């Protein structure tokens, strides 16, 4: 349904894509030959499948009181992890950014 550009230090690295059944997929770009999105996702493999929201991307979301501030500001479901990541995706910890496809 929803797909998103994942970039590393501004360079587009791949697509985080949400599939039906609550599963997710990350696919690297051929053209991308820079540092991995995560040390758990080396460029060695180009496709990564997940039965739940991938822990790397879940680890970019806010916690505690700052999560409640996010849910006070946006009309978003408490567990829409992908939607929340799109909301904060322009600036998160580390070198990765996330921008929604259309």
């Amino acid at each position: 349904m929803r797909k998103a550009y994942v970039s590393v230090s501004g360079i587009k690295a791949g697509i985080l894509e949400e599939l039906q059944g609550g599963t997710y997929q990350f696919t690297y770009f051929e053209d991308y030959h820079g540092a991995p999105v995560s040390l758990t996702m080396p460029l060695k493999n180009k496709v990564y499948d997940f039965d739940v929201f991938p822990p790397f991307f879940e680890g970019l979301l806010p916690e505690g009181i700052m999560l409640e501030a996010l849910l006070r500001k946006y009309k978003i479901d408490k567990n829409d992890y992908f939607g929340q990541l799109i909301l904060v995706g322009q600036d998160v910890v580390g070198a990765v950014t996330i921008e929604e496809i259309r």
């Binding site: 590393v8 230090s9 540092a35 995560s38 040390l39 758990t40 929201f53 822990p55 790397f56 879940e58 680890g59 979301l61 916690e63 505690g64 009181i65 700052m66 501030a69 322009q90 600036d91 910890v93 580390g94 070198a95 990765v96």
Partner: protein, 261 residues
């Protein structure tokens, strides 16, 4: 569990270079500001002095300090180490991300698994094991009982992957009333009533593979720093009452590792 750090804000901020002051922003900041919590007392002053104690024992600690917020209370700041130069970033990943856990399961791990993450991903694991030993002893001595998986991170800097500079180091024991544990993640299956042999024999020798000379030297460093730690706490911005709690816990933890025998 009820975590002290969950009830405190982490505000993005820019340093206005021409003045000596911070501007809070929603995005695109280079500093984090942590103001007072309404749930737990003195968290900014507690974090500021704890991070300074860590620096005094030789852990890698970024720029940090205190500033006055609008309401006369003190607010803590830290210079982000994933932000450098002009709009440049460094890769940074916490151990929940690296071990496949999430925010809900960030306590569902162990110090043994923390070691395994370092062995898998760090450029020089044996060097980072020395750092982890010092960090774990430090957190035990200053009552930091909230080192869960998201409080360990690996940074990629200068093409080397290592344990990141310190962040979020706090004496969470004195900040909260009915403290449940000493370690957030078990060591040898233990989160309370840890002993000297847990740290110096099982942890340092069996699990980290450190040589006895290296262990002895690190212990001596801690012995030597206690007078300066006592002095720094006395001069901190903690209240007198919170200073006494901090010193009393430090002495108890020191005594438990036979520092004064």
């Amino acid at each position: 569990k009820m975590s002290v750090q969950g009830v405190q804000k982490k505000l993005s901020a820019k340093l206005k270079i021409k003045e000596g002051c911070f501007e809070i922003v929603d995005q695109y900041g280079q500093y984090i500001l942590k103001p007072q919590s309404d749930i737990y007392p003195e968290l900014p002053e507690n974090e500021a002095i704890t991070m300074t104690l860590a620096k005094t024992i030789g852990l890698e600690v970024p720029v940090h300090g205190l500033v006055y917020s609008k309401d006369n209370s003190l607010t803590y700041f830290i210079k982000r180490f994933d932000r450098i130069g002009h709009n440049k970033k460094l890769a940074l990943e916490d151990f929940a991300q690296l071990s496949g856990e999430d925010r809900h399961t960030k306590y569902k791990s162990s110090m043994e698994k923390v070691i395994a993450v370092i062995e898998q991903f760090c450029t020089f694991p044996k060097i980072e094991f020395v750092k982890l030993f010092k960090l774990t002893l430090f957190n035990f001595l200053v009552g930091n009982e909230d080192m869960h998986l998201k409080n360990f991170s690996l940074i990629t800097k200068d093409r080397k992957i290592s344990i990141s500079p310190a962040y979020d180091l706090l004496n969470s024991t004195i900040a909260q009333k009915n403290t449940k544990e000493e370690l957030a993640l078990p060591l040898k299956g233990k989160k309370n009533n840890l002993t000297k042999s847990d740290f110096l024999k099982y942890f340092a020798i069996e699990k980290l593979g450190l040589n006895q000379n290296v262990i002895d030297g690190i212990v001596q460093e801690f012995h030597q720093v206690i007078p300066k730690w006592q002095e720094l706490i006395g001069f901190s911005f903690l209240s007198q009452e919170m200073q006494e709690k901090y010193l009393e816990l430090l002495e108890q933890r020191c005594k438990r590792l036979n520092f004064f025998d």
